[PDB]
Structure formats: C-alpha cells, structure tokens
C-alpha cells in the first residue's frame, strides 16, 4: 500500500507489523482492544511499523518502562509520531531530557501540583454537582458535550485565568495535535497556540496575577528569571494537558458504566471503593501513547536501533499487558495490584495526575448518587478515535428521571 514507508535496510523484515496509531484496524472493537492486538500471540516485544513514516513500537510493559527510564538513549527531544510533529514539538519541559529538564518541571509542578488541587477542591465539587443536577430531570444527555468537555475544561480555564468563550478555539487546536483531522499540521496548531499565548504572557508580565499563566510567566528557574519564549512553551503544554486528557478518559469510564449495571451497583452499595475503581478504570481505559528518539546507535532487547530512529512507547499498553495484570481486559474494582503507566514513567511523570484523579473521583461520586441507573441510547453505535491521546466521538445516554435523586 501507498501508506507504507519503504523498510530501512537496518530493520529486520520479520519484525514488521504495520500498526497505524491514528487509525488502527481493530478500532470498532474499542480503541484499547484495537491497540491490544499488539499483544496477541506471535507478536514480538518490539516491532517496526511502516505506517506514519516508519517507527519502532514497544508492545510490552517491560520494554516501555525500561526505555522511559533510559533518557540517555531514548530522548524526549522528538517525542511525537510522525517525525515532522516530533521535530516541531518544543513544549517545556516535555521536549527536554534531564539534567536541563528539571528546573522547568519544578516551576510547572507549582502551578498544577497537589497544593493547587486542594484549593481547587470546592469549585471542582460545585461544578460537577451543578452540571449533573441540570442534566438529571431530562432523562438523557450527550455526555461528551454535556459533561466530559465542560467539566474539566472550565476547571482548567479557571486555573489559567482564561475566558471560557475561548474554549472552542483552543480545544480545536489541542485536538489537532493529538488526533488531527487533516485540516492542520502539528506545526500550524502549535504556532496558533503560541500566537494565542504571546500577548497574554506579555500583559501578565507587566501586571502579574495569581492565575497559572501569571505564575509561569513571572517565575524563576533555578534562581534565574524565565524568558518570554520559555513561558510560552510551558503554558502551551498546560493547555494541552488540561483540554484533551481527562475530557477523553471520563467518556471511556462512563461508556463502561452505562454498559455495566453490576459495576454501577457495586459503587452505589459501596461508595468507599470509588478511589480504587478510579485506578482500575485508569488502567483498563488508558489512552495516551507518545515516545522517544534514539540519540545514538543502540542494541535494545536483541534489536539494533539506529540514531534518529523514532520509537513509540505506548503508556496505554503497559497496564493492558497480561504480563502485568492477569485478565487485563476485565474490570475488577477489587483487583489487588493495579499495574499501569497511564500517567507515564521516568522523569516525565504526569504533573496533572493529582488534578486528574480528583476530577475523576468527584465525577463518579456525584453522578452515581444522583443518576444511579442509566444506559446507552437504544441502537447507539459508539465510535472511538485513536492518536497521541485517544477518545470517544460521542456518548448518548438515557435514563428514567423517576429513578434519580437530588442531593
Ligand atoms: C487522565 C488524565 C491524564 C493522563 C492519562 C495524562 C498522561 C500523561 C503522560 C503519559 C505524560 C508523559 C508524556 C511523556 O512521557 O512524554 C504526561 C505528562 C504531563 N502532563 Fe499529564 N495526563 C493527564 C492529565 C493532565 C492534566 C489535567 C494536566 C494539567 C496541566 C497535565 C499536565 C502535564 C504536564 C505539564 C506533563 C509534562 C511532564 C514533563 O514533561 O516532565 N496532565 N501526562
Ligand atoms: C502526551 C501528553 C498527554 C503529555 C501531556 C499532554 C500531552 C499530549 C503532552 O504532549 C505531554
Ligand atoms: K523537537
């Protein structure tokens, strides 16, 4: 086929497995299931796909974890497939390796870390309760538009001190960086995102505020003042993490819960299991997959990797590996050792994961106590979409208002 880059001389023929991360063949069975074909019998630990310009894929948690730990061989400098995307990608601190990475990571951790989440608690609680109550007596909703998008996005826009009317523009930009529809390259989307931030960063360096953008723009890295460019590159990433992560994960969880009455009942009768259920859903419905670039020629697990070779290291795949979790496709809220790399692994561990867990846990509690019984709209065929971050196209839900409660 014409979508397959010619196999490089140095890549073994028997290791070819043409997986397409933006449109995987088994997509209709579910996106996690679609990626899981990389872990079927007779598929190697490390394969090469000729799709998307050609790149390596580590298919098992063992290799995914090791590579993320080895930044000297596997650089974050070019972290996105395809190559053109990875080269344009200059977000901070993600496009940097240690030692230079760390000083910027401490600054970002200040604006979205645990202490910030704690002071955001009550507004997060209120917004969820507000959205769910307004939806409740209607007996139906389009969950992606009606909750999964505005709940975490409005929360981030509050944190960042940005107007909610900007959401449609910014959301479109982030989605082109993760699941491009074709209208925009990563380079064009990033430049437009930077174009948005530039005058906001300048004005908030003259009149500082208490919002995340003011804090980054006026911050210091290892004792020296952060530049305008640096702040722009850091803020841009924060918008991506805030607009296209939790949004997608909530839909996966709620799609599951609508199709599994036994599981809803388990959390209704025992609400104190909601944190544990959150982690299991985080495992079973993992959704992010980026990677690294080789700094030099390097033999990795019997395979010869050449300098400049890209390797996808799918965070999603680790927890779905039966070698980390028995019956990985089954959801067990009582699962004893929930193993995953959903928030990443190595020096680039997710800084927003504490914000993410709170948003997930609150949604679960506040939805189940108000709308305990619900399901998918009759006849609805749920479509998923695949990319750097995967998601749900639409999730139509129905319920009987009489079965609901007000808290
Ligand atoms: C379900 C929720 C989320 C998931 C599964 C997730 C996933 C990930 C992954 C896999 C990475 C590492 C990427 C790599 O190693 O190249 C990462 C890093 C990062 N995330 Fe999250 N993310 C989530 C939510 C959020 C939120 C809400 C924010 C809010 C700002 C955020 C901000 C960041 C930042 C700034 C980094 C960069 C860390 C670094 O490069 O050192 N994320 N995330
Ligand atoms: C891969 C990510 C999920 C992580 C946070 C947002 C994201 C798209 C970034 O590029 C780093
Ligand atoms: K780059």
Q: What is the 3-state secondary structure (H, E, C) of the chain?
A: CCCCCCCCCCCCHHHECCCCCCCCCCHHHCHHHHHHHHHCCCCCCEEEECHHHCEEEECCHHHHHHHHHCCCCEECCCCCCCHHHHHHCCCCCCCCCCCCCHHHHHHHHHHHCHHHHHHHHHHHHHHHHHHHHHHHHHCEEEHHHHHHCHHHHHHHHHHCCCCHHHHHHHHHHHHHHHCCCCCCCHHHHHHHHHHHHHHHHHHHHHCCCCCHHHHHHCCEECCEECCHHHHHHHHHHHHHHHHCCHHHHHHHHHHHHHHCHHHHHHHHHCHHHHHHHHHHHHHHCCCECCEEEECCCEEECCEEECCCCEEECCHHHHHHCCCCCCCCCCCCCCCCCCCCCCCCCCCCCCCCHHHHHHHHHHHHHHHHCCCCCCEECCCCCCCEECCCECEECCCEEECCHHHCCCC
Q: Which of 351, 364, 368, 397 is catalytic?
A: 351
Q: Which two tokens stand for residue 403?
A: 């079965």
Instruction: Count other C-beta atoms under 10 Å from residue 70's C-beta.
Output: 15
- Other Cβ atoms closer than 10 A to 321: 20
Quickly tell me which residue has 């053109």 as its tokens: 84
Q: Which one, of 183, 385, 188, lies nearest residue 289 by Cα?
A: 385
Q: What is the bridge-based pairing of β-strands 55-58 and 46-49?
A: antiparallel
Say whether 352 is catalytic. Answer: yes
Backbone angles phi, psi at 46, to 5 degrees: -145, 115
Given a contact cutoff of 8 angstroms between Cβ atoms, the answer to whether 384 and 144 are in contact is no
Q: What are phi and psi of 305, to 5 degrees?
A: -95, 135
Asked, as a colleague might, if the bond just before 99 is cis with ω within 30 of 0, I would say yes
Q: From the candidates 141, 350, 355, 397, which is the catalytic residue?
A: 350
The CA distance from 205 to 371, in Å, is 45
Residues shown for the chain: 407
Q: CB neighbours of 222 closer than 8 A, spacing ≥ 6?
A: 103
Residue at token pair 């208490």: 210
C-alpha 293/C-alpha 97 separation (Å) is 11
Residue 244 annotated to the active site = yes
Instruction: State the Cα–Cα distance between residues 17 and 53, nearest whole angstrom.
Output: 13
Question: 162: domain range?
Answer: 1-407
Task: Tell me the C-alpha to C-alpha distance, in Å, between residue 72 and each of 96, 289, 308, 342.
Answer: 11, 20, 13, 22
Work out which ligand 1 atom sits closest to the CA atom of 315: 10
Nearest CA to ligand 2 atom 11: 94
Using the atom order of ligand 2, give the atom closest to the CA of residue 352. 5
Judge whether 86 and 80 are in contact, CB under 8 Å.
yes
Instruction: Indicate the number of domains in the chain.
Output: 1
The answer for residues whose C-beta is within 8 angstroms of residue 217's C-beta and 6 or more apart is: 201, 204, 205, 208, 226, 228, 231, 235
278 labelled catalytic: no
Question: CB neighbours (10 Å) of residue 110?
Answer: 15
Report the DSSP pairing between strands 391-392 and 220-221: unpaired
Cβ within 8 Å of residue 254, ≥6 positions away: 143, 147, 148, 367, 395, 397
State the Cα–Cα distance between residues 399 and 395, nearest whole angstrom: 13
CB-side neighbour CA atoms (13 Å) of 259: 13
Q: From the CB of residue 33, how many other CB atoms can be counted at a distance below 10 Å? A: 15
Q: In CATH, what number is assigned to the domain containing residue 152?
A: 1.10.630.10
How was this model experimentally determined? X-ray
φ/ψ (deg, to 5) at 389? -125, 130
Measured in angstroms, the resolution is 2.2
Q: What are phi and psi of 231, to 5 degrees?
A: -65, -40
Ligand lying closest to the C-alpha of residue 353: 1
CA distance 303 to 299: 5
Task: Tell whether 350 is in a known binding site.
Answer: yes
181 part of the active site:
no
Give the Cα separation of 87 and 110 in Å (integer).
28
Q: Beta-carbon neighbour count of residue 174 at 10 Å?
A: 22
Asked if 60 and 40 touch (Cβ cutoff 8 Å), the reply is no
Separation of first and last alpha carbons in the chain: 57
Query: How do 310-312 and 55-58 pair as beta strands?
Result: parallel
Report angle CA 165, 170, 172 to the nearest 5 degrees: 115
Q: Is 402 exposed, middle or buried (0-12, 13-18, 19+ CB in 10 A)?
A: exposed
Instruction: Tell me how far the alpha carbon of residue 316 lies from the centroid of ligand 1, in angstroms.
Output: 13
Task: Report the separation in Å between the CA atom of 160 and the middle of ligand 1, taken as the mean of its atom positions.
Answer: 16
């Amino acid at each position: 086929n014409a979508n397959l880059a010619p196999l490089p001389p140095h890549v073994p023929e028997h290791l070819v497995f043409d997986f397409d991360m933006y449109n995987p063949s088994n997509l209709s069975a579910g996106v996690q299931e679609a990626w899981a074909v990389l872990q079927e019998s007779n598929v190697p630990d490390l394969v090469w796909t000729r799709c998307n310009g050609g790149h390596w894929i580590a298919t098992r948690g063992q290799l995914i974890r090791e590579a993320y730990e080895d930044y000297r061989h596997f650089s974050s400098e070019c972290p996105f497939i395809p190559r053109e995307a990875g080269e344009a990608y200059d977000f901070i601190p993600t496009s940097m390796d240690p030692p230079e990475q760390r000083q910027f990571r401490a600054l970002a951790n200040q604006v979205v870390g645990m202490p910030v989440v704690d002071k955001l608690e009550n507004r997060i609680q209120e917004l969820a309760c507000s959205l769910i109550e307004s939806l409740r007596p209607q007996g139906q909703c389009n969950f992606t538009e009606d909750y999964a998008e505005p709940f975490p996005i409005r929360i981030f826009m509050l944190l960042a001190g940005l107007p909610e009317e900007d959401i449609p523009h910014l959301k479109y930009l982030t989605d082109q960086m993760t699941r491009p529809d074709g209208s925009m390259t990563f380079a064009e989307a990033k430049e437009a995102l930077y174009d948005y931030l530039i005058p906001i960063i300048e004005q908030r360096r003259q009149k500082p505020g208490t919002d995340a953008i003011s804090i980054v723009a006026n911050g210091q890295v290892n004792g020296r003042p952060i530049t305008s460019d640096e702040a722009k590159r850091m803020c841009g990433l924060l918008l991506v993490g805030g607009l296209d992560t939790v949004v997608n994960f909530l839909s996966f969880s709620m799609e599951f819960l609508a199709k599994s009455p036994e599981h809803r009942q388990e959390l209704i009768e025992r609400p104190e299991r909601i944190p544990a259920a959150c982690e299991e859903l985080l495992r079973r419905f993992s959704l992010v997959a980026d990677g690294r670039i080789l700094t030099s020629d390097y033999e990795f697990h019997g395979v010869q990797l050449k300098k400049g070779d890209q390797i996808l290291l799918p965070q999603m795949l680790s927890g779905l590996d039966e070698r980390e979790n028995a019956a990985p496709m089954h959801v067990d809220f009582s699962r004893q050792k929930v193993s995953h790399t959903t928030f990443g692994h190595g020096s680039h561990l997710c800084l927003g994961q504490h914000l993410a867990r709170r948003e997930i846990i609150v949604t679960l509690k506040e939805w189940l106590t108000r709308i305990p019984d619900f399901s998918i709209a009759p006849g609805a065929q749920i479509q998923h979409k695949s990319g750097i971050v995967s998601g749900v196209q639409a999730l139509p839900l129905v319920w009987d208002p009489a079965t609901t409660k007000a808290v």
